[PDB]
Design a protein around this ligand. Structure first.
Ligand SMILES: *[C@@H]1O[C@H](CO)[C@@H](O[C@@H]2O[C@H](CO)[C@@H](O[C@@H]3O[C@H](CO)[C@@H](O)[C@H](O)[C@@H]3O)[C@H](O)[C@H]2NC(C)=O)[C@H](O)[C@H]1NC(C)=O
Ligand SMILES: *[C@@H]1O[C@H](CO[C@@H]2O[C@@H](C)[C@@H](O)[C@@H](O)[C@@H]2O)[C@@H](O[C@@H]2O[C@H](CO)[C@@H](O)[C@H](O)[C@H]2NC(C)=O)[C@H](O)[C@H]1NC(C)=O
Ligand SMILES: *[C@@H]1O[C@H](CO)[C@@H](O[C@@H]2O[C@H](CO)[C@@H](O)[C@H](O)[C@H]2NC(C)=O)[C@H](O)[C@H]1NC(C)=O
Ligand SMILES: *[C@@H]1O[C@H](CO)[C@@H](O)[C@H](O)[C@H]1NC(C)=O
Ligand SMILES: *[C@@H]1O[C@H](CO)[C@@H](O)[C@H](O)[C@H]1NC(C)=O
Ligand SMILES: *[C@@H]1O[C@H](CO)[C@@H](O)[C@H](O)[C@H]1NC(C)=O
Ligand SMILES: *[C@@H]1O[C@H](CO)[C@@H](O)[C@H](O)[C@H]1NC(C)=O
Lengths: 582, 208, 762, 170, 115
């Protein structure tokens, strides 16, 4: 009957009373851990407990509430004590996590003198889930730069662990993993699941996007499955993913042609109405929180005979009224536009793009921050001459005294991390006999050894501490830095200053950046907010100056992450900009 | 050394085809190993002098202020010194490591220092959080295959002798006798019992 | 200098003789001739016409074509062009030389040169393209070959790909081709079988092992053998006809694998009537043999008096378990086993080889054979030599040598296995010169038995006495051997089996039948044969269970005795103690020494305690210490690789007659008939042990699935070699953690092998 | 290379959750390491010693006397039966005993276990040794002299004087 | 007693997190450099050394300061349930004579035990 008249909850597979998907269920435990660790900090500022009571719990002794004669309070002693009576690894992580957070807040509030607070994306590992509570095949930890593959149920896939690579690895979906293994070894799936014959066994068929195809077949016959999981047997000529869901909070309204999600979805209660992909996942930037969110498709065709935008889609407003049909390119979740935001305008009447045509290959995969940078300034104590010689001479003197390498005190052999290049030293003439010198140390994270510098905080302190920047400030403040140039001596002044984001301070601050071929998509200031700040310049593009710029008309580029655009043959040209093939 | 070819035997260890160069023949390998054995008797080492030892010898001969100091296995010592002068730390090439020049004491040349890296790895393991796959210990398979089986232990100690081999003698011997994995694989192909191995490698019972 | 010794499709610019010069001068000229030609990409300095003595030659080239036959690669497995005896290009400084690779091309006027076009097309759709997530880089890989294609010799990548896919398609042992772009060339790599699977209780994920990263990976799908492909496989058997099997789906974790099963395949004529107590004979069958049901099992002591339907003298059959879509030339396990059934049905074999075959990716053959009197009755002389059941095992092994290719197995990759009694019986094949001259097997798995057992062979006079006692028990005459055999050949099998069960009781005469030295198959006792120098190498995996013992092995005989009205009287205790440790196994001194060492009380009435002490005494003497002696001898004399296990005591599954090592190694926790009886920890332990045993069958080392890969095992801890020296002697303990331990039963086996073997030597 | 394999196996003799090693300011292992209520002593490479681990407490790590005693006792197990090789005697706190004897000859020794000249005698003949305050005092007259290149005060009889003073000696 | 009352003092003016003594009991202490914590007059080291040695002294010290924290609070917030303990029921204090020697009789008022 399935009638509702009683209290309900969600339960595990073995009756644990705890509906969430696998990844989302694991995700909720980590969110509980953070909340408890912050409750410990909360109770540690308003003094409700003695300092030594957690030590007493760690030794197995707890004082019952009757023998204390302590009238119960809303934050009962029991809530705090249970966390620490079980001397498990959970309590040790909980006590550690709350211990840093207590001190880091205090240090900051009393006097934020020494250094910067940690980026808010360096925290406990949080599982990354898809739109339907399942595991995303790629799992990453920003605080260490570690990425790995998991299978359909979140188990680590052997030898898939990578550390601080330029490209985030590719991990097969559950369908693709099952299909490739089935083709190699004939380890198959069962169609009937109870006493299967060899004709009931099948190898899953996958859509090119990595999803299970709606119809799976064996020699016994065919049947329908859930696209997000092959579980199948949806008993509601195969039900669409929406139709399976239709019989995500509010149930989605879907289009009659095939069953694909209608472009405009809505929340009946909350006022939010937004757009969705063909998959049914939400476009990240479309929640309108109002009627008729701009979900309309363009009337102008794409620039170079391309069928559809790869990652995102071009979502216009309603047909405008004069002929603009204002549109904008919105990339899907897990994608960013390589080129900066643009407003696109379409000629409904010419039927051609009046504005710059949209870039079909813009939306790309973001990557982690790839470089760290610190900058210091000192002064060397004629004009209207070629100073670029002094840029080479100063770099040589810095190299000679070991200020262009980081030496890491490892166990055996020490690795050396190079932190200079030909652009590291810039000199400007300020006044007679006093030159102005800029020194910039840039560490590429792919060179920092993950075994000696585990966290990105360890990398920052190696670059802005006693081995590189603290050791250089002392040398300048002493007075023993002089440059030998044809029997002439250029001794340096004792004053040294550090860049701190447009305010020269007295302490070095690091700044995140991207590698040579990768364009910035996150501003420098809010690099503490978002960890994915680098996208590779796409096929239609070249790199200059931290941005990815589309090949101009008459030029084409075919390989991504390039520094120039190949010209077309003298007899030919390109109709639009951003051409991406011969 | 003048090595005489009149009384050298023939050997079982060999390839299927004749070598491309003389450096890849059994003739060169036999001469090289006999040379190393004589080096062992006349110098204490189953090898030739290292870069450190050559420079130490030249400095002592010409009485230079800075004499490099070497470990008995030939490696540069971490702490180098000048006569009544400054002290510093060097790398494996004997080149001074920047920022380590002390004055009076033999410098605190960082030798073991496994702790601060170990301590950092433990903190990053603590901070990872409760659930999820993580980011002095035995290297994989080494203990089981080499030490659980009891293969290594008879190699280390003398048989009917109180002589205990230094680690350098064992490392020098394996390098001198088998320059590559492919040559050691050839020896295993043609050596049935280990009582024949020295006779094949040296063209005779040379070590006695 | 190129590492490649053979170039195909080259383009020559000039040919210059250099025989009137020194080799150094000729090389110097050849270098400067290619310098002067702006279109020269390299030269050859070589001897041509080497069969007439060789002529020094300089060849300037404007294309190197397809470069093959590297000296660095193709060591174990070569597929490409090699061995041109009319040319000498190896000896220094001969070789093919390349002008240094530059991204600046030759002058535009240089002739265009391209590799000759392929005679037939390449589908690209008959090849499976693999992603990088389906491969593992393993630099220990050795069974691969390499070719290079000059980047100027092919118009584009598609031409290079079709050339390299064509080479692999011509060789049937080439399974995988990978392509990778180098600055100067396209590097093609060809692989044999390199598959590696991760086994768990959820899903079985299999990957390819490659020597290095590559950009495109193409695999050739496995084509089924002529009679395979459907759920009614029909395999041609040469000189016989068709063999019709069935197909079964096998579940491990949440994955399913189809395995083809051929049940009840005859390997000899039924030994009935005049064929009783005779050597096995060829069975001439033609047409179609229906091989979908298990056949009858052989007579064994203690069969129940209402005769079960599956007991017969017609029992010389084998079962073949073939997983679908294996790579060619699979390794083969031949496991000899007579089931003491009562639980196995008429449609399911008692030992199902499907799970080990599927997990191990190999072929399993289980065979039955004559045991007891039917397999070993002997008069101690040429009149009734005996060893009839040993000759069954030889015939069954010869059948595998003749016929296994048709199922897809390599006759050179056969492992012989047996358990308990058969391990003692099957270990005789290791000391017979005929079994080595026939190369019936390459490896052996002995599970609870040894050739150094005190009961391995029966002395000829004891056999004559034991034959007469059976004649006397059934009413036959013992006066002449020919007269006694005739009367025993007219008896019902039920009558003969009741007589042998009565005489086999340890509390009675202890008349056990086994192999005898006959002077034909077995020329001398196993101890003498093993003192000789080995002729061939055989890898040995050997072990024992703490739950084994003589009484455990004879529980059916004991049950029969009780049903006949014979209990443990005081003289039963007496005979149990004397028979166990005696009968050529003890004088009056060995019995006293063992009595002291094991606290054996001859004149007790507590059958429980006395049996426990005796079972501990006889397990060491008959089972555990002979296993350790054989492993030590096999390692000390370099007869092959030795690996030892020990299965510690269990209390969990006494209803099953299989001991712990066979139950785990063959995967009984995964059998559908035992659902609900095993924990997930026993399933997980069994899956690991099947990977150990599969690895040994495939490569002779329980740590490695492939002979030419040495990637460390990940499913469990590595299994050490057995080194026969004090302080070493390591073994794998078959417990949940699979630890490595040292010196099994060191004190107890010293007593038997040193002190007792010296009491018997005086 | 195969020489590297030999070094890796040699290093691996004696090899092995949320344990955090404690380091010194100079980057060396603190010689006492503790986790989850246990504490043990470690060597320079940070390897636990066999008998150091103590539950619910902090161990005292081996001293000079204790290490010599454990070394001489692993070689008295190679000497023949009825034979004596010297073995130093150590108090419970690791210090040397005032008198050491060997083949019926006895010496007074200092805190480093070195014979004091003029103190030898025969076993069975009582010998007056300098007091522990006299020895730590002398041993510190040259702690001072070495550094230029408090020292302890001994009430009558050599018993430590209850009042102790700092500074240069006088 | 003075140390046990210092623990109560630091437990009212919040200078330490509640879980740091638990961390010390498990053997993990955070050094001052990695916290980047500028030293204060009641340095973290003074409190932590008491608890890194997991001795019986620290267990008695943690227990003693735990009752005193709650008994003061109970009283200050609302002295409803019962009376404070007599101030002569405390840790045993040795009774000495006029010259620092032991009095032959030793008594513990909190238990009524004399020896
Ligand atoms: C490449 O070809 C050249 C020329 O054909 C080879 O040189 C020739 O080598 C043979 C034998 O090695 C020499 O023949 C004679 O051998 C007898 C032995 O019976 C010896 O007594 C003579 O003194 C002489 O060596 C021949 O002189 C020699 N010719 C020249 C011009 O040197 C060469 O061996 C070939 N290289 C390879 C690697 O095959
Ligand atoms: C001293 O050495 C000679 C020479 O032996 C050869 O050269 C050695 C360096 C070593 O490589 C040996 O294996 C070589 O055989 C010995 O004389 C030889 O002795 C062996 C066995 O006695 C005999 O077979 C050879 O024919 C002998 N050869 C000659 C030229 O005499 C000699 O025995 C050695 N002396 C001692 C005391 O060992
Ligand atoms: C040395 O570094 C300083 C700080 O980065 C540079 O000063 C900046 O110059 C840019 C470009 O002229 C301005 O937009 C910023 O506002 C300046 N910042 C500050 C704090 O002055 C300076 O130009 C550098 N000198 C050289 C020669 O490169
Ligand atoms: C503690 O709480 C007070 C308010 O009661 C607040 O002002 C102060 O900032 C807090 N200190 C922290 C969170 O470190
Ligand atoms: C590659 O070259 C071949 C050579 O004939 C020819 O098919 C064509 O030029 C190219 N084909 C492709 C698919 O690039
Ligand atoms: C199996 O091996 C044999 C000999 O090694 C070889 O000739 C054959 O090609 C291989 N494959 C098949 C399918 O027989
Ligand atoms: C805590 O300190 C405040 C003053 O800061 C005081 O008023 C209060 O009574 C104290 N609470 C105690 C000692 O429990």
């Amino acid at each position: 009957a399935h009638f509702d008249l009683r209290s309900c909850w969600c339960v595990d597979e073995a009756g644990q009373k705890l509906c969430p998907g696998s990844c989302e269920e694991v995700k909720l435990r980590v969110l509980q851990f953070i909340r408890e660790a912050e409750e410990i900090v909360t109770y540690s500022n308003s003094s409700r407990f003695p300092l030594g009571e957690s030590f007493l719990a760690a030794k197995g002794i707890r004082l019952t509430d009757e023998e204390l004669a302590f009238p119960p309070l809303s934050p009962s002693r029991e809530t705090f004590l249970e966390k620490f009576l079980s001397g498990s690894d959970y309590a040790i992580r909980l006590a550690a996590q709350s211990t840093f957070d207590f001190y880091q807040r205090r240090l900051v509030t009393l006097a934020e003198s020494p250094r910067a607070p940690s980026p808010v994306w360096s925290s406990a590992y949080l599982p990354q889930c898809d739109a339907f509570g399942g595991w995303e095949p790629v799992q990453c930890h920003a605080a260490t730069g570690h990425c790995w593959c998991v299978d359909g149920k979140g188990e680590y896939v052997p030898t898939s662990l990578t550390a601080r690579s330029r490209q985030i690895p590719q991990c097969p979906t559950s369908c693709e993993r099952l299909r490739a293994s089935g083709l190699l070894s004939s380890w198959k799936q069962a169609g009937v699941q109870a006493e299967p014959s060899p004709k009931d066994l099948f190898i899953p068929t996958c859509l090119e996007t990595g999803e299970f195809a709606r119809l799976q077949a064996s020699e016994a016959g065919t049947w329908c499955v859930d696209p997000a999981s092959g579980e199948g047997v949806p008993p509601g000529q195969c039900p669409s993913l929406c139709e399976v869901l239709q019989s995500p909070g509010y149930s989605p309204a879907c289009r009659a042609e095939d069953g694909g999600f209608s472009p405009v979805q809505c929340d009946p209660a909350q006022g939010s109405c937004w757009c969705v992909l063909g998959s049914g996942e939400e476009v990240p930037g479309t929640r309108v929180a109002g009627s008729q969110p701009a979900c309309e498709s363009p009337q102008c065709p794409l620039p170079f005979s391309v069928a559809d935008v790869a990652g995102g889609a071009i979502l216009c407003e309603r047909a405008s009224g004069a002929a603009g049909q204002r549109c904008q390119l919105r990339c899907s979740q897990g994608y960013r536009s390589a080129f900066p935001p643009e407003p696109l305008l379409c000629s409904v009447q010419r039927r051609r793009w009046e504005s710059r045509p949209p870039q079909p290959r813009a939306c790309q995969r973001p990557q982690f921050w790839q470089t760290l940078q610190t900058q210091a300034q000192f002064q060397l104590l004629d004009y209207s001459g070629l100073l670029l010689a002094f840029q080479v001479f100063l770099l040589d003197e810095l190299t000679a005294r070991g200020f262009c390498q980081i030496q890491v005190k490892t166990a055996g052999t020490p690795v050396s991390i190079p932190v200079c290049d030909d652009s590291s030293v810039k000199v400007e003439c300020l006044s007679r006999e006093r030159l102005g010198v800029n020194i910039t140390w840039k560490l590429q994270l792919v060179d920092a050894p993950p075994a000696s510098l585990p966290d990105l905080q360890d990398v920052e302190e190696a670059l802005a501490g006693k081995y590189l920047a603290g050791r250089f400030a002392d040398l300048i403040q002493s007075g023993t830095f002089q440059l030998h140039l044809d029997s002439k001596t250029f001794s340096a002044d004792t004053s040294i200053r550090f860049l701190q984001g447009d305010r020269f301070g007295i302490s070095p601050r690091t700044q995140f950046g991207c590698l040579e071929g990768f364009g910035r998509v996150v501003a420098a200031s809010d690099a503490s907010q978002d960890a994915l700040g680098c996208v590779k310049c796409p096929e239609g593009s070249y790199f200059q100056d931290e941005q990815c710029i589309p090949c101009p008309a008459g030029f084409y580029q075919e390989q991504a992450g390039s520094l120039a655009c190949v010209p077309c043959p003298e007899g030919r040209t390109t109709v639009y900009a951003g051409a991406f093939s011969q | 050394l003048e090595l005489l070819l009149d009384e050298i035997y023939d050997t079982i260890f060999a390839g299927l085809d004749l070598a491309s160069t003389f450096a890849e023949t059994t003739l060169y390998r036999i001469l090289q190993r006999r040379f190393l054995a004589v080096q062992l008797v006349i110098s204490g080492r189953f090898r030739c002098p290292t870069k450190c030892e050559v420079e130490r010898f030249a400095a002592t001969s010409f009485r230079h202020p800075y004499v490099p100091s070497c470990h008995p296995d030939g490696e540069y010592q971490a702490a180098q010194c000048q006569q009544g002068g400054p002290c510093w730390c060097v790398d494996s090439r004997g080149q001074e490591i920047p920022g380590t020049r002390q004055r009076g004491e033999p410098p605190s040349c960082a030798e073991d220092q496994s702790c601060p890296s170990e301590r950092r790895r433990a903190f990053s393991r603590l901070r990872f959080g409760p659930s999820g796959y993580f980011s002095a210990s035995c290297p994989p398979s080494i203990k089981e295959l080499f030490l659980d089986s009891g293969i290594f232990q008879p190699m280390l100690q003398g048989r009917d002798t109180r002589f205990v081999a230094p680690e350098s003698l064992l490392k020098e011997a394996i390098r001198g006798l088998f320059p590559s994995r492919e040559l050691a694989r050839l020896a295993l192909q043609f050596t049935t019992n280990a009582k024949r191995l020295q006779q094949n490698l040296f063209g005779g019972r040379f070590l006695v | 200098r190129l590492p490649f010794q053979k170039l195909t499709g080259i383009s020559i610019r000039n040919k210059v003789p250099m025989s009137d010069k020194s080799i150094s001068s000729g090389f110097f000229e050849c270098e400067r001739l290619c310098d002067m030609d702006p279109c020269c990409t390299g030269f050859g300095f070589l001897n041509v016409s080497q069969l007439k003595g060789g002529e020094v030659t300089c060849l300037t080239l404007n294309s190197l074509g397809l470069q093959t036959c590297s000296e660095e690669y193709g060591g174990v497995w070569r597929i490409l062009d090699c061995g041109s005896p009319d040319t000498e290009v190896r000896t220094y400084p001969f070789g093919w030389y390349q002008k240094p690779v530059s991204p600046s091309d030759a002058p535009s006027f240089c002739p265009s040169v391209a590799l000759p076009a392929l005679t037939e097309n390449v589908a690209l759709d008959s090849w499976q393209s693999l992603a990088l997530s389906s491969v593992i880089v393993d630099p220990s890989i050795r069974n691969f070959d390499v070719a290079h294609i000059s980047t100027a010799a092919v118009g584009n990548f598609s031409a290079a790909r079709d050339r390299c896919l064509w080479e692999c398609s011509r060789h049937q042992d080439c399974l995988v081709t990978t392509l990778q772009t180098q600055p100067g060339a396209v590097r093609c790599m060809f692989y044999a079988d390199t598959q590696s699977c991760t086994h768990s209780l959820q899903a079985q994920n299999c990957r390819l092992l490659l020597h290095e990263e590559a950009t495109y990976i193409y695999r050739k799908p496995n084509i089924p053998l002529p009679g395979f492909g459907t759920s009614s496989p029909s395999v041609p058997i040469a000189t016989h006809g068709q063999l019709l099997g069935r197909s079964q789906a096998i579940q491990v974790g949440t994955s399913w694998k189809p395995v083809d099963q051929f049940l009840g395949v005859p390997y000899a004529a039924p030994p009935l009537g005049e064929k009783r107590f005779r050597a096995p004979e060829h069975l001439n069958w033609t047409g179609s043999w229906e091989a979908t049901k298990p056949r009858a099992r052989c007579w064994q002591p203690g069969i129940r008096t209402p005769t079960p339907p599956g007991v017969s003298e017609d029992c010389l059959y084998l079962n073949v378990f073939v997983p679908q879509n294996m790579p060619p030339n699979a390794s083969v396990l031949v496991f000899f086993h007579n089931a003491a059934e009562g639980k196995g049905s008429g449609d399911r074999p008692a030992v199902d080889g499907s799970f080990l075959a599927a997990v191990g990716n190999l072929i399993v053959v289980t065979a039955s054979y004559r045991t007891g009197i039917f397999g070993f009755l002997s008069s101690g002389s040429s009149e009734l030599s005996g060893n009839w059941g040993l000759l069954d095992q030889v015939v069954a092994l010869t059948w595998v040598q003749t016929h296994i290719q048709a199922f897809g197995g390599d006759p050179r990759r056969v492992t012989l296995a047996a358990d308990r009694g058969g391990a003692d019986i099957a270990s005789i094949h290791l000391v017979t010169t005929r079994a080595a001259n026939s190369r019936l097997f390459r490896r052996a798995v002995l599970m609870g038995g040894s050739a150094l057992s005190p009961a391995a062979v029966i002395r000829p006079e004891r056999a004559r006495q034991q034959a007469a006692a059976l004649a006397k028990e059934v009413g036959c005459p013992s006066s002449s051997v020919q007269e006694m055999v005739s009367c025993l050949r007219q008896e019902p099998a039920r009558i003969l089996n009741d007589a042998q069960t009565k005489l086999l009781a340890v509390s009675g005469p202890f008349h056990y039948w086994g192999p005898v030295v006959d002077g034909q198959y077995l020329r001398e006792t196993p101890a003498r044969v093993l003192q000789r120098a080995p002729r061939v190498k055989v890898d040995l995996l050997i072990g024992s269970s703490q739950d084994d013992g003589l009484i455990n092995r004879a529980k059916a005989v004991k049950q029969f005795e009780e049903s006949q009205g014979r209990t443990s009287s005081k003289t039963a205790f007496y005979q149990a103690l004397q028979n166990s440790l005696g009968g050529e196994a003890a004088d009056a001194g060995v019995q006293a020494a063992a009595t002291w060492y094991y606290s054996l009380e001859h004149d007790s009435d507590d059958x429980a305690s006395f049996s426990r002490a005796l079972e501990q005494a006889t397990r060491d003497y008959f089972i555990i210490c002979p296993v350790i002696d054989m492993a030590s001898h096999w390692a000390r004399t370099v007869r092959g690789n030795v690996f030892m296990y020990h299965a510690p005591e269990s209390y969990s599954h006494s209803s099953l007659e299989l001991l712990t090592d066979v139950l785990y190694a063959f995967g009984l926790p995964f059998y559908p008939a035992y659902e609900g009886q095993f924990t997930l920890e026993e399933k997980s332990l069994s899956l690991k042990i099947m990977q150990y045993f599969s690895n040994f069958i495939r490569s002779g080392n329980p740590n490695y699935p492939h002979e030419f890969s040495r990637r460390a095992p990940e499913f469990a801890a590595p299994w050490p070699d057995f080194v026969p020296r004090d302080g070493a002697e390591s073994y794998k303990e078959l417990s949940v953690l699979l630890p490595n331990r040292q010196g099994l039963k060191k004190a107890d086996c010293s007593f038997w092998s040193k002190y007792i073997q010296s009491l018997k030597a005086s | 290379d195969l020489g590297d394999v030999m070094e890796m196996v040699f290093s691996s003799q004696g090899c092995g959750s949320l344990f955090v090693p404690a380091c010194t300011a100079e980057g060396s292992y603190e010689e006492v390491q503790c986790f989850a209520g246990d504490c043990w002593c470690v060597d320079a490479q940070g390897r636990e010693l066999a008998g150091s681990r103590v539950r619910g407490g902090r161990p005292r790590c081996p001293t000079e006397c204790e290490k010599q005693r454990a070394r001489m006792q692993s070689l008295l197990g190679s000497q023949p039966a009825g034979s004596s090789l010297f073995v130093p005697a150590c108090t419970s706190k690791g210090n040397f005993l005032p008198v050491q004897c060997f083949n019926s000859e006895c010496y007074c020794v200092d805190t480093e276990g070195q014979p004091i000249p003029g103190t030898r005698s025969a076993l069975g003949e009582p010998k007056k040794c300098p007091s522990p305050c006299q020895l730590q005092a002398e041993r510190a007259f040259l702690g001072t002299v070495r550094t230029l290149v408090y020292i302890p005060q001994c009430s009558a009889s050599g018993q430590w004087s209850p009042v102790q003073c700092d500074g240069p000696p006088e």
